[PDB]
Structure formats: structure tokens, C-alpha cells
Symmetry: C5
Subunit: 205 residues, 5 copies
């Protein structure tokens, strides 16, 4: 019990906190989605609501430690306030994201951080033709708001979204769901900005 207390004190209280990634010291964030439900569809304003949980995984050299020196400790859970977290944002959002999970992450001895946030997102989607047998398709882009491609890079373990936890008695059934990596070029800035496209094809009843 005392060994875990001194590990946290040596990592956070002793050393100064991480000031984000540089173009000289970049970072790579692994992502992945778990779709749970398509709760609401509004035809009069063209905005659809989703319930899901995202995967936020990365590695830091500052968070590395030897388990033998701290009594065979391999990993530990800590508050999200104690460590740095990436600024992944949904671009086509209409209303601010509602958090449905605690703000805790888990760190491993190799310096790898794991954070899984539960969310309710309202985004821009035209649902014309949801009643037909063919269905309707909608998409949303996720990525850093401030960091470019030279500071933060995104990767996906699989291109298929996990639907094993999707709500059986939902008002809308999923036909296809994919998570694919993209490289954007905005008119504002010459620097490219990497993102992940969440594409969902759904139909009524």
C-alpha cells in the first residue's frame, strides 16, 4: 500500500508535468469506438444523437518505471487531472458532449496510458430516407483542435466499429459502422491535420 503511494509521489509531485508534444517530440494516439445506441433523430433540424465509448491510448517516456524497485507494481489507476490528455474533438457537433463515465485512467510501467470516456454526442446528420429498406448514411470526424500532423498522429487498430454492445431493442438498427483514418488540408493553415471518420449506415425498426 505504501509502495503505490511513493510511486505516485515520485512521478507527479517530484517531476514537472508534461507540456504537450512538440514537432521534435511527436505523439501517436490510438483510437477506436464502441457504439451502444442511436437514441434520437430530429428531422426538423437535421441533428442525430449517439451513445458510445471511445478509446484513448498513448505512451510517454516520463511515465515509465521499474516494477522491482516499487514492489512488483505493473500498473495503477489515477485521476485524469494528474496526467496530460489529448484534445480530441468532434467537428460536426451541434451541442456540447455529455460525459457518462468517471474521469479516471490507467497507467502501465512501460509508460502507456489508457483512457475510455463514455459520451452522448449530438451532431449534423440529414435523416431523409431512414424509413426505407435501404436506410440512411451519416458521418462525423474526430481529431485534435490545436495540434497538427507534426505534433499528434492518429492510428486505428481495426477499421470495423464494435457493435457487440449495441442495444437490441433500439428504434434504429445498424447496417454498417466503420472507423477510418484521414489526413485533412484546411484553407487556414498550411499544416495538415489528421482525423478518424466515423461512418454509420442505419435504418428504422
Amino acid at each position: 500500500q505504501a509502495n503505490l503511494m511513493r510511486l505516485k509521489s515520485d512521478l507527479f509531485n517530484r517531476s514537472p508535468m508534461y507540456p504537450g508534444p512538440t514537432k521534435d517530440d511527436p505523439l501517436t494516439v490510438t483510437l477506436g469506438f464502441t457504439l451502444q445506441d442511436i437514441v434520437k433523430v430530429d428531422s426538423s433540424t437535421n441533428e442525430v444523437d449517439l451513445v458510445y465509448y471511445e478509446q484513448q491510448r498513448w505512451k510517454l517516456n516520463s511515465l515509465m518505471w521499474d516494477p522491482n524497485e516499487y514492489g512488483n507494481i505493473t500498473d495503477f489507476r489515477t485521476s485524469a487531472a494528474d496526467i496530460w490528455t489529448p484534445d480530441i474533438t468532434a467537428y460536426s457537433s451541434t451541442r456540447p458532449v455529455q460525459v457518462l463515465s468517471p474521469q479516471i485512467a490507467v497507467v502501465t510501467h512501460d509508460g502507456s496510458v489508457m483512457f475510455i470516456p463514455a459520451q452522448r454526442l449530438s451532431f449534423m446528420c440529414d435523416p431523409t430516407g431512414v424509413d426505407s429498406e435501404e436506410g440512411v448514411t451519416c458521418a462525423v470526424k474526430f481529431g485534435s483542435w490545436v495540434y497538427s500532423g507534426f505534433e499528434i498522429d492518429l492510428k486505428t487498430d481495426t477499421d470495423q466499429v464494435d457493435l457487440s454492445s449495441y442495444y437490441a431493442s433500439s428504434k434504429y438498427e445498424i447496417l454498417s459502422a466503420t472507423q477510418t483514418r484521414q489526413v485533412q488540408h484546411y484553407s487556414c493553415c498550411p499544416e495538415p491535420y489528421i482525423d478518424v471518420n466515423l461512418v454509420v449506415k442505419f435504418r428504422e425498426r
Copy 2:
């Protein structure tokens, strides 16, 4: 009056706070539900609202004390911010939980903590056939979001939900309410996670 002041100072201000349970030092939480009302039912989005107060108790060796040394003090009330609390979360939730009770807990000399939070939860539930004499059945699982089975375990004193405080003039009548223990395996993670399944069978009038 001075004896209670020095007990709190010796426990919190002197000793460092608990860093959560480890696989070497696990914890067991006792969970219990008191259903008060089924306030709203939405057919167009399949989401139902419940009013209830949950029961959560655990024991810690750090919170133990001798009553004779502190002037025969057996127990005391303290703010939830002063102590560690488990991360019990509802999985099938659609919107964030609303707290309806103060953030206070009561600690005993044996190191046992008692916390009773009042909540209003909106979760995924298809209410097709609530008007019928047979009624409709719905469920929701509660458990830790970050800690696995090796770190946190759950237990229930009884499998029957307390309906002695249920609202008499409610729009819906309860037919059966049960709180049963479960051990889950998710597609994400090899570690098994323990939860409590709340199952309610209700009907109109």
C-alpha cells in the same frame, strides 16, 4: 467536541490519502437499491427515468481507530470529499445521473464506511406493452468502470429490491424488482468485471 476535531486531524491531515485498491490488496463493496418511483416513460426514444437511493458500504484498515483513546467515539459523519469512494457506474445510461442527496458519509471505528446517494437515472428501456395486464420488463447493470474483478468485487445482502418506500399514487405499479450479482466478459479486455443487475417488471395503473 475537541476529541472529534483531533480524531479527524489525525486520520486525514496527518496520514496520506488511500490510493485505491490493488490486485494485492482488493476491496469488496456491498450494494443495495431502494426504488421510489418510475417517473417518466418515452416510447419515441425508448428511455425510462427512475428515482431511487443506492446503498454502498466498504471497510478500510487506514480508517480504523481506538474509541477509548479519543473519548468513547464509536462513529462520525464526514464529507465525501475527505475519503475515497468507489467508481460504481450505470452502463445502459442515456443522460448523466442527477444527485438528489447531500455528499456526506458515516465512518465507524472498525474502519467501515457507509454512503447512501439519492439519484435520478435515465437508461435504455423499450416500454412496448406497458398498458397490458402482463406488463413490460427492463434491466440496467451497475459496477466499476476502471477497476476489474481482481481489484474490486461486489456483493448483495439480499436479491430482493426494497419497495417499502415506493410511491403509492405512481402512474406505473411494480410487479417484481430484483438485484442479482453478475461476472462479465467483454470483447475489449481479458480481465473479468463484476456488476449488479437491477431488473424491474412494471405495468400501467
Copy 3:
């Protein structure tokens, strides 16, 4: 001006804060209600909204002072964060209470504290027969959530609710409003709990 500054410094900054009442050192809280309006009535969910301001006074030996020593100061206003406040809660609520007044209280040299919070409460009430000449009757109980009868007692100066500030052009007119002290017994615990039952008889127009 300097005399009021040193009085607050001697009471709060010098002495440690009150750790709540004990079974050896109990407290008695005086409670009052001033009904202002019955703003909303929902028939589909059986929940009613009230606008009112509650009265709460209690005395503490720690907050006592001599006026002659601090330049004839009899009383002073201070933030609710600087002092201890009772955990009075409404039991039959469906949604969290909305505060409509500042978080300030007034303390007197005898150690008596005065706190008057303005609130908007939505509680459980069946409004069937509000349109009739007879009207409809509803009740809500206010009491401590954590402290038992041996720790906190409740008393009322009068059993008649103050309706002198009730809204004249309201959609609902009051026929009778009473505040009475009652002792509850919960199956959970052997300790009895005290509350104040707010009973209101109202009619449409």
C-alpha cells in the same frame, strides 16, 4: 471597519471549524416556510413545482463573542462557506433543487446563525381533481439525510405556513397550508429520524 475584520479572523482563521453535532452534544434547528407560488402541475407524470423561501436558525457556543471587546458589534453577515450548515433535504423530490437566493447568512453575538435560502422544488404529487371546487391535497417531508434524532432535532415556531407573500395572479389558489413536526421510522436503522411535513390544499383559478 478594522474591528469587524479582526472579529472574523479570531472566529474562523484562529479556531478550527465545527465538526457537526454529536449524540453527546446535539443541535436543534428551527424551521419555517414562506410559500410564494405553485408554478407548474404535471398530470402525465404526477409531479408539482413550488417557489418558496425556507427559514433555518441554530445556535453555536463557538460563534459567541463579547460586543464591548470588538467595538460594540452585535451582528454581521458572512458567506455560507465560512460556517457549518444543516443537511435539511426534501424526501419526495424528482429533480434537484434550484437555488434562487445568495449564499450569505447573518451571525449574532449570542452565537445564533440565520439562513434564508430561496428554492424551486419539483416533488411527487397526484393532482387529480384540482379543477373541482373542493381542490386537491399534497404533502412533502423535510429532514436531515445523515444525522439521526439523537444528533439533530427539528422544531417549528408556528404550525401555519406564511402565505402573506403568495402570488395573487397565480394559476392555483391556496385553501390551506400547514408545517408540522413528525418522527419517521425507517426499517434500515434502529435510530428514529425527525422531519417537518409541508401539507398544501390548493385549487385551480
Copy 4:
């Protein structure tokens, strides 16, 4: 640039903050109202919503300074957190006030403070006869909740509300708007309380 930095440091960081007005050291707050819009009218609950920006100015001897000593500085803008602010509250409110302007005030060398908060208030108002050519009249009171007349007093520069900034294409047209001072006597307390009565006469179309 350095002169403004040392002025703020000498006033706030050096001297202790103002503990509010006393019966020995009173304060007078000048109030004003600029009506912008009557956005919503609810007939089923008798509650009307207004968009406006309130004016409040007071003087403090502690905030006085010599401009020649600090490089000809006459005034400066500062956060509302850095200084004391009066507890002006709307009495007939139904839901909490929404702030629509930044929390900044401007202080002058004579110790005079200027604060202009933009608000959206929902208050008690019966709108029966708004569709009539005569229109409907409603009123709301503003004043201190805790300090009485002997501590804080209120005054108005003019009795006519500023409608020069009122929304032209609004659903409701103003017929008359006045701001008048009052002295209210409460049964609770011996000290009388001062307020300002905002009376508005409006009609539909």
C-alpha cells in the same frame, strides 16, 4: 504598463478585502435598467421571460488613489472576483438568472465602481389580455437579500426605463416601462428593506 500592475498589487494584494457595509459605515447603490426584449410568454404557468442589462454603481474609500503617484492613471478595468459586489436579487423569480455578459467592472480614482451585467430573467406574471389593444401590465422587484436599509440603500437616476435598445421586430411591443424606489417592511426583522419596482405594460403584435 508597470504602473497599472503596481496599482492593482497595492490595492488588492497588500490591503485586506472589504467585509461588506455596516450600520456605522453604510453604502448607497444606484440602479438602472435597459430593456432589450420580451422573448417568451407562458399562459399555462403564468411566467414571462425578459432580456435586459442592469446598471449598478457604488463608491468605496478603500478603492481611492492619487493619479499623479501612479503615472496619471484615472481608471482601470478589473475582474468582478477581485472586488466586493452587492447582493441585488429579483424577488418574484421562478428560475435562476442566466448571465449573458463578462464578469468585469471598471474602477475610478475617486473609488467609484461600475458594473453592468446582462441577464435573462424568468418571473411571475399573468399575461391574460396581451392580445387586447389595452395590453397587460406586470412588475418585478430588485434589492438586497441579506443587508437592510441601514447597511445598503438604493437610488435611481431616472424613473423612466431605457427602451432605446429594445428589439424592433419583437413579438410584443412596449406601451410603458418605469423604475421606481420602494421601502418594504417585513414582519421578520426590525430594519426596513429598500428595493426598485420595474413595471412594464406590453401588448402582442
Copy 5:
């Protein structure tokens, strides 16, 4: 990594924070708008909702640094709390602005700051004749609430609003969108106040 840490410590922790612009030391803030969607239109209350992200850039002599002294660092990302930000406010707003982007800005060695906040604003707009081929026109002014013309001056790089990121399948199509600089004279104050008028002409389908 250590070079970026000592740069932030030398700029913020060592030197006192900027106390805003003076009439002796004024500031010029460049403003821009990127319209994304016209999500909702309410005819019963005359209030329209927009989704967009604002551009704001200014320069400060205090935030200047030599890149060679800190290991060739040209720029860095930092929290909006660490630096001063202008008080740009929408005047015709009906409800508080919702933030849809992280609170981070990017500072360059020349002392130039870049801040891009994503927002959802509800403002006063009469939508009578949106169904017609001609459409309907609406405007909203943006500018400082406390600082005048002598302290803060606003400028625009172009008078044409960026519609390259506007939602294709929106319920309303844009006919014209312009951002123009204005100098307003209010009845309250002899001081002139500068704003940017955002004028949008839109039609249904």
C-alpha cells in the same frame, strides 16, 4: 522537452500577468468568422441558432522571446487560463453561448497569440419569409463589453464570411454572409465602442 518547460516558467511564473490594455497602451484584435450551420429557427419567439467558429488574434510585447536562447522554439500551445483574452461579446444574444472546442491557444516568439473558439449562439432574429425564394436577412454585432475604442480597436482581414465549411445537407441554404467593422455611439456613454456586424441572408431548402 526541458527547454519548453523553462520558457513557460520564465514567461508566466516569473513575470506578473498582463492587466489589460490602457488608453496609453491600446490593443488591436483581428476578428473572423467561419459559418458551419443554421441548425434551428423559432417563429413563435423569433430566435435563431448558429454553429460557427470565431477567429481572434492579437500581439503582446510581454509574450516575446528569443528562439536561440530556448533551443530553437518558434511557437507553443498553452491553456487559455494562462494568458489574457479579449472580452468579445454578442449583443443581441437570448441565451448563454455554448462552447464546442477546447480552451487552448497557440503563442509565437514575436508575441502573437491565436485563439479559435467553436460556439453555438442563440440570438434575436425574425424569420418571417424564410420559405420564399427571396429569403430572410438577420444580423448580430460582436465586440468588447467593458473596453471602449481608446483601449481596444477591432479589424477584419476580409469582409466575406468563410462558407467553405458550411453543412451541405442543412435545412437552410446561405445566399450571402458578410463581416463588417462598425463604430457605435451609445446613449449611456460618450466613449465610442467598436464592433463587427455579422449579416446573414438565408432561405429554406
